[PDB]
């Protein structure tokens, strides 16, 4: 297969466009001088996430490709936002599919989905990640961060903002290098040498709670716990898993390009056997997907769909396997928020494990027939593509060649899709692989009004972003492990448009000014996922030859249809069609 | 002064109960101090070695020895939640209100670390509840700042 | 030739010494513990550029050489100035010479040289740069940036400085992460989920011009267009190219170490075939140098020479090929500002392309005779070193400062060796420096005590000076969907003469506008516009020939005898053709 | 021997926990996706040093290993403190040992080890680096730094702090881009073109001394030399080396993979002969080790100083140079270095024997020499001193598996060691490989008092850190060579707890405030050397089988003893025992 190297990076609280224009383009522009690159593609998403896939000529040493890529990326790191650099950019040489899934449950229900995910992140993942042959490890959940959930009413009452909270966290959850008594070079006759220990990282919600934000003029004290609820909670909240219906986390593991599937799986098991004896009580490993005897089910809702509606479709998928197919199905491991090659509120995947082959006698209880029956049973689910499959028509890219922009590239894509629908004898299921634009909330900061009041733009933009998107402040130590500290609004003050007006910002004169005084907003449409292909804006189209027609005849028609599109719009074949 | 002094600091430090008999018997200075002004009694108090504390007091160890920053073995036992050592020091005459250079008392340190069983014993033996450190802070103030209601209950 | 890895960096508005001492030395000190390394050299230039060349033993794996050089560079990366890091430091494994040139012109004349260069940089360069076997791609021109050309009279009229301009641009050409409504974790039962979109990058001169710098006391507004002119313009203006005397841009393409030349040129032609159908009207590719059929003409004036003076010599060369060699020469692609030596204002190059073998019968009409005659015709041109040639018995000498003597004494020593070698024509022909001579520079001393007394800060002083006369990369913007740079700089007419220093104001802590003249003094001095280094020490490269018939060995042996009489602290080594 | 890669980093003025929790953990957490890794170990110590050693499977290519490690480290660089990034984080193949160690000494009493290290760095090391067959070369010392040694009494006299010193040096030892007259694009017809040259880096103590800190209100100047002494000195002062009692630097030279040992050694000697005519007076080259050297360990107690260690090494040297004058060529005494711990209380004497043929009879062979030395040195009070020459031992890692913390893991370690001593039948010399906790000086900053007074906590922490720990400010040019500038307190103002209160910080309102107004302190214990194994906290334990028992049998008991430790404590075998 052609080897692929994957770059992943993250910008908390950024929309697709922000990610694309401060990150994706910058990295793309600096991927020169790398040998044997066939093509490059990328997604920039409204989860704050970028994935760039660099696919190499057949026969390329994946070692060398990874290194060349990493080295180029390294020289581009200084061009990226501080917020992205500090999340840590990853580069991987792996299969896109999963080798295995390690599931983790609590048989005594002593631990929630959230506790289990943190246990896994904090105690299991790193060692699994360092195992040889492990190309990519996906956590089905999030590690804990110290979460500071801010309250705008309490902030405003004490004339504070998230800037003051952030400032105080960096000053009071600090790790200070303070030198030594009797340190070198010393005076003559020194008898004593000892390290000086000043501030050290905080370790608990207790300690973060007593961060002293200010002393009032009457001598009283405003602590962090007075403007915020303080708790361990995920770095993010987007991925939730279940195993046969019960709370779960896990590791989805992908095989490093060129590694041995069996040796890697065995090494992963040997490493899990080192960790089991020190598990808290109730914790238990299950094995829901080991690559015949397994298959997956994909769940794609249209963009705009929440966690809750994706959950409901997954419950129906899970239900079906646990009721209608219970004689053939041993387990279902279901992940809400992670997709075949995506991550969003609108997607999910179920990993399905069958009983022993010998106990499923008959052609109708073999994997092919099972997956096919499941596909039929889910085909009539409302507003979701839901299909079961084990782990070929055409793969087309429509390309913006002349700075046309997203809106016009969308119009052109639609013109081509509409023309392709008028040839049902040659083309079947000609569709976008990506996502449709959705409503978004466009807020305009009045620069004149901010200046007339003495409100600083930086304070406004930090207040908005930290409250509504969350901000990674610095690190702390949770049971001896380094982990992140995040400041964000408590859920109920960031749900609705009118909530914007309850956030206040302090002017240079010390007056609190509500966000309503310097902003205005309107609804508009934009993209939750911007795609690019060899450095240019793109839209991936999938489809196939109609029955009794060759793949090549169908491709030829796509090219004819493509030649009638508006000026500036080209195309290319990629993937299976290259 | 004495080589046995130094060895006695080391064995009190490392919890070697038998080696501390043998060094006492041979004339080791029970009030030998290391370079930070810690005596065997400090070391035994900090590392929670009950039997060693007892053996040292019985051999005349100075119950209120202070280090170069004014801290006494009771300060250390109190801060590190060594209850049974706090009781023994207090029975042998430890100054329950001893202040260090910062004006910190054993009650402040017990209170800051939420060692309730110890706070009670300290108050039992006459610990001053309104004693201020150099910043004005009482054990009560510490309870409010750490938001430990259990400890606040006890100090009204 | 042996394989070379090259490191390049850029520091806009930096002089050669600043480049050497803030960038080159810091990188050079980590260049050790690298396998099969023969030698290292570098130039630090007053164009703000540094190039370090690391040359490896024959047979070295170039992937591994590149990897090991880069891994040592990474040690210096966080000690480099932020202004250098942000330009994108590069590490390449290429041949030193061009495989081909891709020329671009507009047959309708509806696009200037500036537009063509931008079109090439924005729509063509990157894909070529990613093609396998492309070692180095060099743009003959510059991508557009958003240019804010400041006026100091207007800035001072509203009590503003370039610092207020830079600040205003960072704040209002901004790309903000603003989160979501209804984001996770939500209040359970939430239906509405929508991204919040706040400020986004500016995309046009119109948007930059309405940037708000201040509200006065009377409620009037000062916009950025009120203190600056605003246009699309090159990141720099140093490289201008021509094809048969028409406005042109282009890509010069060097082959990656060990790559197949045929396959690589084909992949480049295939990649151009994808771009061609989306060109705006008039735009055309031309092929002015394919690798005999072709040759180059180097043009090197002495340091200090402006663009104007280099153009004149290029015009004489171009004139010669289009008038005298009319029947032989198909095209001339001439580049002003870029030569063999890298990049500079006093340098240029012509790539010449001949007609078909079989339209040039006769020996006087072959590449060697043409080159011979062209060189002969140019030999008479004064204040210029103009040579025609088509790609050996000489030597490559390095004079090295081995005792901290410094640049001025090393020059004195170079001169002593050059004058002494000039008395031995029987053994040595044309012994000459390969480098540049010192030129007048404008030395300005900031009086710290005055600055402190007036309440003017040193950072404000240096930014105002640097932004105005050197230019400053502030942040990025989006031009026709592509990320591009934003630069502030003085409009030309305010940064041309020494007295213009006095017209730039800095704002004090107490609100007062203080002219530059109140806290600075200046004088003329000499310094170097290209500082060289060999294996990490100051150096001056000297070239020459064995005299007729005498061997290289005998010429080198003399050069070593002369080198032995030079002042204490001055040594030497042999590089390139002389190393073996 | 399996190939090994070592990551070395440095955090000046940092304690072991500060280094572990801001560097070591962060680097460990990014050591994923590396092929063929067997295990990873690390030390983080009180000198501000972390070493992370990655050991790979036998027959792994060491260059590939090095490069993969290095790329992961380099992507994690932005996650590290700036102060650590600025020292450089090196990734080197560490499994190969030395071809030769070359001492550079001064014999006529005119040069310090710092003076010698500078000469070597600027005149010798690079030519040795380019010599035929040479791989890595390590300088045992540094090039000069410009040392600014601050005086707190004069700083307070003029209402200044170290922050002001640091700010002034960044401002007045600077070199920035000032642009040109007549630069492009010009007014057409421009004739003048000239670079503008503004400030340039400082070159000398004289120039640093004239740095203007401030103009007083009466019009007098405070210059840097009025608050500080100014000298060229070392970057670091943790080590003091002598060769037969005289000041010494050196070079540690490794053979390039594939090259010839004997040709390379001769090529180095030849190259050092070329340099000898250019030396200053009394500089001499010695060859203490070159392809019979033995060592003497020196270990002083907790809290012992450089000077006290020196005294003992001086007795060790005098013993060998008198009592073994017939047998010993040299003693190279390295104060501050050991193999299992750096620090003021350790050192090591490298003893070079005269040729085999000049030491006839068994009396004068290594083995009898080392016994005599050990017998004589065992009557040194206040130090452990062991002479030694460098299939029986074992290598055990005790592992914190459940977030126990250092205090609890030590108690578990003591439980294991106390049990192993109850079986002298099976086990001998079962001991920690590392160091014990020691007194450290804990200073708490009072945030309320600092806020009431208007004293900024960054001012507090920079004042403490820069004075007592030292700070790398920026770079200067010394005789045309770029070098570092360090600020730190003069020795006599950073020796003892009382000196803390002589340091003043400037409040928001211009009043000077002493450290004692907002701080309190106490003695406590903590670790001068934290260990980790496969990314978990760990304690290495060495031992051996009792006479007439197999190493296999000894291991069996250690494992069985290990099964009875507190909950959460695990173990692993490493090194010779893997
Ligand atoms: C900061 C100043 C400074 O370090 N000075 C300073 C000056 C000179 C020296 C050299 C002392 S001589 C010496 N040093 C060694 N070291 C290398 C080690 C990896 O770090 C050094 C610490 C000590 C070794 C050997 C010798 C010998 N002979 C022999 C073998 C068996 C090969 O083991 C290593 C060391 C330090």
User: What are the boundaries of each domain within chain B?
Assistant: 1-156
Cα atoms in the Cβ-side hemisphere of radius 13 Å centred on C177: 27
CB neighbour class for D567 (10 Å; exposed up to 12, middle 13-18, buried from 19): exposed
Query: Is the C-beta atom of D241 inside 6 A of ligand 1?
Result: yes
Resolution of this model in Å is 2.3
What does the H/E/C string look like for A321-333? Answer: HHHCCCCCEEEEE
Tell me whether the omega of the peptide bond preceding residue A93 falls within 30 degrees of 0, making it cis: no
Mapping DSSP to helix (H, G, I), strand (E, B) and coil, where does residue D486 land?
strand
Mapping DSSP to helix (H, G, I), strand (E, B) and coil, where does residue C305 land?
coil
Q: Token digits for D191?
A: 């004739």
Distance D333 CA to ligand 1 centre (A): 9
CATH superfamily ID and name for D98-143+235-291: Multidrug efflux transporter AcrB pore domain like (3.30.70.1320)
What is the number of residues in chain B?
A: 156
Q: Which helix (H) or strand (E) holds C275?
A: helix C261-275
Fold of A293-391: Alpha-Beta Plaits (3.30.70)
User: Which residues in chain A are contacts of C136 at CB distance < 8 A?
Assistant: 33
Tokens 């055409």 -> residue = A394
Domain A392-436+528-578 bears CATH identifier 3.30.70.1440: yes
Backbone angles phi, psi at C454, to 5 degrees: -80, -15
Q: What angle do CA A337, A339, A344 make, to 5 degrees?
A: 40
Contact, D205 vs D167, CB < 8 A? no
Q: Token digits for D371?
A: 């016994």
Protein residue closest via CA to atom 35 of ligand 1: D140
* Domain D1-97 and domain D98-143+235-291 have a common topology: yes
Short-list A161, A160, A148, CA closest to A230:
A148
Q: What residues of chain A have any CB closer than 8 angstroms to a CB in chain B?
A: 191-192, 194, 206, 209-210, 221, 223, 225
Q: Which CATH architecture has domain D391-436+528-578?
A: 2-Layer Sandwich (3.30)
User: Which residues in chain A are contacts of B146 at CB distance < 8 A?
Assistant: 206, 210
Q: Do A451 and C92 touch (CB under 8 A)?
A: no
DSSP single-letter state for residue C364: G
Cα gap A55→A2, rounded to integer Å: 6
Cα gap A420→A541, rounded to integer Å: 11
DSSP single-letter state for residue C131: S
Helix, strand, coil percent values for chain B (each to nearest 5)? 55, 0, 45
Short-list D473, D466, D510, CA closest to D489:
D466
Cα gap D506→D518, rounded to integer Å: 13
* Beta-bridge mates of residue C221: C215
Mapping DSSP to helix (H, G, I), strand (E, B) and coil, where does residue C461 land?
helix
Cα gap C502→D181, rounded to integer Å: 13
Cα gap C148→C159, rounded to integer Å: 18
Distance D103 CA to ligand 1 centre (A): 9
Contact, D295 vs D349, CB < 8 A? yes
Q: Chains C/B: 3 or more C-beta pairs closer than 8 A? A: no
Short-list D119, D344, D349, D353, CA closest to D251:
D119
Output the CA torsion sign for D364, D368, D373, D375.
Answer: negative
Short-list D300, D435, D304, D342, CA closest to D47:
D342
DSSP single-letter state for residue A276: G
* Beta-bridge mates of residue C98: C254
Cα gap A70→C89, rounded to integer Å: 14
Tokens 């005298």 -> residue = C324
- The Cβ of residue C151 has, within 10 Å, a number of other Cβ atoms equal to 17
Cα gap C235→C155, rounded to integer Å: 23
- The Cβ of residue C276 has, within 10 Å, a number of other Cβ atoms equal to 10
Q: Token digits for A436?
A: 């449709």
Tokens 């040299």 -> residue = D330
Distances (CA, A) of A559 to A548, A551, A556, D412: 20, 13, 5, 72
Contact, A474 vs A485, CB < 8 A? yes
What is the number of residues in chain A?
A: 578
Instruction: Name the residue of chain A whose CA is nearest to B34's CA.
Output: A192
DSSP single-letter state for residue C274: H
Cα gap A549→A547, rounded to integer Å: 6
Instruction: Name the residue of chain C whose CA is nearest to A308's CA.
Output: C189
Span between the terminal Cα atoms of chain D, in Å: 12
CATH superfamily ID and name for C1-97: Multidrug efflux transporter AcrB pore domain (3.30.70.1430)
Mapping DSSP to helix (H, G, I), strand (E, B) and coil, where does residue D301 land?
coil
Q: Which CATH architecture has domain D292-390?
A: 2-Layer Sandwich (3.30)
Cα gap C19→C83, rounded to integer Å: 11
Where does chain A break, by residue before each gap (C–N > 2.5 Å)?
291, 391
Q: Token digits for A390?
A: 């084990």
Contacts of D354 (CB under 8 A, 6+ apart): D326, D327, D328, D329
Nearest to C181 among A30, A31, A497 (CB): A497
Tokens 């019985």 -> residue = B58
Contact, A9 vs A87, CB < 8 A? yes
Cα gap A100→A353, rounded to integer Å: 11
Q: Which helix (H) or strand (E) holds C368?
A: helix C367-378
Distance D239 CA to ligand 1 centre (A): 11
Q: Which CATH architecture has domain A98-143+235-292?
A: 2-Layer Sandwich (3.30)
Cα gap C79→D128, rounded to integer Å: 25
Cα gap C252→C258, rounded to integer Å: 18
Tokens 């991936």 -> residue = A540
Distances (CA, A) of D369 to D260, D315, D381: 33, 16, 21
Distances (CA, A) of B51 to B16, B41, B74, B80, B88: 10, 11, 15, 17, 10
Query: Is the C-beta atom of D250 inside 6 A of ligand 1?
Result: yes
Q: Which ranges of D292-380 would DSSP assign to H, the alpha helix?
A: 306-323, 366-377
Mapping DSSP to helix (H, G, I), strand (E, B) and coil, where does residue C383 land?
coil
Backbone angles phi, psi at A212, to 5 degrees: -95, 110
CB neighbour class for D214 (10 Å; exposed up to 12, middle 13-18, buried from 19): middle
Please give the interface size between A and C, counted as residue pairs whose CB atoms are below 8 Å apart: 209
Backbone angles phi, psi at D507, to 5 degrees: -80, 165
- The Cβ of residue B93 has, within 10 Å, a number of other Cβ atoms equal to 11
Q: In what order do the strands lie in the sheet with A481-489?
A: A228-234, A144-150, A481-489, A471-478
What is the number of residues in chain D?
A: 578
Q: What angle do CA C187, C188, C190 make, to 5 degrees?
A: 75
Tokens 């297969």 -> residue = A1
Query: Is the C-beta atom of D101 inside 6 A of ligand 1?
Result: yes
Contact, C134 vs C271, CB < 8 A? no
Cα gap D248→C519, rounded to integer Å: 48
Mapping DSSP to helix (H, G, I), strand (E, B) and coil, where does residue B55 land?
helix
Q: Token digits for D290?
A: 């070159």
What is the number of residues in chain C?
A: 580
Best residue in D414, D522, D525, D526 for a mutation probing chain B (most B CBs within 10 Å): D522
Short-list A21, A234, A261, CA closest to A113:
A234
- The Cβ of residue D324 has, within 10 Å, a number of other Cβ atoms equal to 18
Cα gap D10→D12, rounded to integer Å: 6
CATH superfamily ID and name for B1-156: Ankyrin repeat-containing domain (1.25.40.20)
Cα gap C251→C140, rounded to integer Å: 6
Q: Do B147 and A194 touch (CB under 8 A)?
A: no
Q: Token digits for D71?
A: 């790329």
Cα gap A23→A17, rounded to integer Å: 10
Tokens 């010449």 -> residue = C352
Q: Where are the domains of chain D?
A: 1-97, 98-143+235-291, 144-234+437-527, 292-390, 391-436+528-578
Q: Which method was it determined by?
A: X-ray
Cα gap A62→D411, rounded to integer Å: 47
Q: Token digits for A389?
A: 């499959």
Contacts 24+ apart (CB under 8 A), C516-519: C516/C461, C516/C464, C516/C465, C518/C450, C518/C454, C519/C446, C519/C447, C519/C450, C519/C451, C519/C454, C519/C456, C519/C461
Contacts of B72 (CB under 8 A, 6+ apart): B42, B64, B65, B66, B94, B95, B98, B100, B106
DSSP single-letter state for residue A256: B
DSSP single-letter state for residue C444: E
Cα gap A241→A120, rounded to integer Å: 13
CB neighbour class for A374 (10 Å; exposed up to 12, middle 13-18, buried from 19): buried
Best residue in D16, D32, D494, D533 for a mutation probing chain A (most A CBs within 10 Å): D32
Cα atoms in the Cβ-side hemisphere of radius 13 Å centred on D498: 3
Short-list C273, C181, C427, D565, CA closest to A497:
C181
Cα gap D540→D572, rounded to integer Å: 10
Query: Is the C-beta atom of D294 inside 6 A of ligand 1?
Result: no
String of DSSP letters for B76-110:
HHHHTT-HHHHHHHHHTT--TT---TT---HHHHH
User: Which residues in chain D are contacts of B34 at CB distance < 8 A?
Assistant: 302-303, 439
Q: Token digits for A345?
A: 């509120």
Cα gap C563→C414, rounded to integer Å: 10
Distances (CA, A) of C359 to C54, C293, C318, C354, D575: 43, 12, 21, 9, 76
Atom of ligand 1 nearest to the CA of D295: 31
User: Which residues in chain C are contacts of D130 at CB distance < 8 A?
Assistant: 32, 37, 39, 535
* Beta-bridge mates of residue C139: C251
A253 CA to centre of own chain: 16
Cα atoms in the Cβ-side hemisphere of radius 13 Å centred on C126: 21
Q: Which ranges of A432-550 would DSSP assign to H, the alpha helix?
A: 447-453, 457-468
Short-list D232, D22, D263, D300, CA closest to D134:
D263
* Beta-bridge mates of residue C348: C299, C336
What does the H/E/C string look like for D169-200? Answer: HHHHCCCCCCCEECCCCCCCCCCCCEEEECCC
Kindly give the interhelix angle for D457-469 and D162-172, rounded to the nearest 10 degrees.
Answer: 80
Q: Token digits for A274?
A: 């080192």
Contact, C41 vs C532, CB < 8 A? yes
Domain C392-437+529-580 bears CATH identifier 3.50.50.60: no
């Amino acid at each position: 297969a052609p080897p692929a190297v994957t770059i992943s990076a993250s910008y908390p609280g950024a929309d697709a466009k922000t990610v694309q224009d401060t990150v994706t383009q910058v990295i793309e522009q600096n991927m020169n001088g790398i040998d044997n690159l066939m093509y490059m593609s990328s997604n920039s998403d409204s989860t704050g996430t970028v994935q760039i896939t660099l696919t190499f000529e057949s026969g390329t040493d994946a070692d060398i490709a990874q290194v060349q890529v990493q080295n180029k990326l390294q020289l581009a790191m200084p061009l990226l936002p501080q917020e992205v650099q500090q999340q840590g950019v990853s580069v991987e040489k792996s299969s896109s599919s999963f080798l295995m899934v390690v599931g983790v449950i609590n048989t005594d229900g002593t631990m929630t989905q959230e506790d289990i995910s943190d246990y896994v992140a904090a105690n299991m993942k790193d060692a699994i990640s360092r195992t040889s042959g492990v190309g990519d490890v996906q956590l089905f959940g999030s590690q804990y961060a110290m979460r500071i959930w801010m309250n705008p009413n309490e902030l405003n009452k004490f004339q504070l903002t998230p800037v003051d909270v952030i400032t105080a966290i960096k000053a009071q959850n600090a790790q200070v290098a303070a030198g030594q008594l009797g340190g070198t070079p010393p005076v003559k006759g020194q008898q004593l040498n000892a390290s000086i220990i000043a501030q050290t990282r905080l370790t608990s919600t207790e300690e973060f709670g007593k961060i002293l934000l200010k002393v009032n003029q009457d001598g009283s004290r405003v602590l962090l716990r007075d403007v915020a609820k303080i708790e361990l909670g995920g770095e993010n909240y987007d991925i939730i898993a279940e195993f046969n219906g019960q709370p779960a986390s896990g590791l989805g593991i992908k095989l490093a390009t060129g590694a041995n599937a069996l040796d890697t799986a065995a090494a992963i098991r040997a490493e899990l056997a080192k960790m089991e004896p020190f598990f808290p009580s109730g914790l238990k490993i299950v094995y829901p997907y080991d690559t015949q005897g397994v298959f997956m089910t994909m769940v794609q809702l249209p963009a705009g769909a929440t966690q809750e509606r994706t959950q409901k479709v997954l419950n129906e998928v899970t239900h079906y396997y646990l009721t209608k197919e219970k004689n053939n199905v041993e387990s279902v491991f279901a992940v809400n928020g992670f997709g075949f090659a995506g991550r969003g509120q609108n997607t999910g995947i179920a990993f399905v494990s069958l009983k022993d082959w010998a106990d499923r006698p008959g052609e109708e209880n073999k994997v092919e027939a099972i997956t096919m029956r499941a596909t039929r049973a889910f085909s009539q689910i409302k507003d979701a593509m839901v299909f079961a499959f084990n782990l070929t028509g055409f793969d087309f890219e429509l390309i913006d060649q002349a700075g046309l922009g997203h809106e016009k590239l969308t119009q052109a894509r639609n013109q081509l899709l509409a023309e392709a629908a008028k040839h049902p004898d040659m083309l079947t299921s000609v569709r976008p692989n990506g996502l449709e634009d959705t409503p978004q909330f466009k807020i305009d900061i009045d620069q004149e009004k901010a200046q007339a009041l003495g409100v600083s733009i930086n304070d406004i933009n930090t207040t908005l972003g930290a409250a509504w998107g969350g901000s990674y402040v610095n690190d702390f130590i949770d049971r001896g492990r380094v982990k992140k500290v995040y400041v964000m609004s408590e859920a109920k003050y960031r749900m609705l448009p009118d909530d914007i007006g309850d956030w206040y910002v302090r002017a240079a004169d010390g007056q609190m000014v509500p966000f309503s005084a310097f902003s205005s907003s309107r609804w508009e449409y934009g993209s939750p996922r911007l795609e690019r292909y060899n450095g240019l804006p793109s839209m991936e189209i999938l489809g196939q030859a109609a029955p009794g027609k060759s793949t090549g005849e169908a491709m030829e028609l796509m090219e004819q249809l493509a030649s009638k599109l508006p000026t500036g719009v080209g195309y290319d074949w990629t993937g299976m069609s290259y | 002064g004495s080589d046995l002094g130094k060895k006695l600091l080391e064995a009190a430090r490392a919890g070697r109960d038998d080696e501390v008999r043998i060094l006492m018997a041979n004339g080791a200075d029970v009030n030998a101090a290391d370079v930070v002004g810690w005596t065997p009694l400090h070391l035994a108090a900090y590392w929670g070695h009950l039997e060693i504390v007892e053996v040292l007091l019985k051999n005349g160890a100075d119950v209120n020895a202070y280090d170069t920053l004014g801290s006494t073995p009771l300060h250390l036992a109190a801060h590190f939640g060594h209850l049974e050592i706090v009781e023994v020091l207090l029975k042998n005459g430890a100054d329950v209100n001893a202040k260090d250079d910062n004006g910190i008392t054993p009650l402040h340190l017990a209170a800051n670390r939420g060692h309730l069983e110890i706070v009670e014993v300290l108050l039992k033996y006459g610990a001053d509840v309104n004693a201020q450190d150099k910043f004005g802070k009482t054990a009560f103030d510490i309870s409010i700042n750490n938001g430990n209601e259990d400890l606040a209950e006890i100090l009204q």
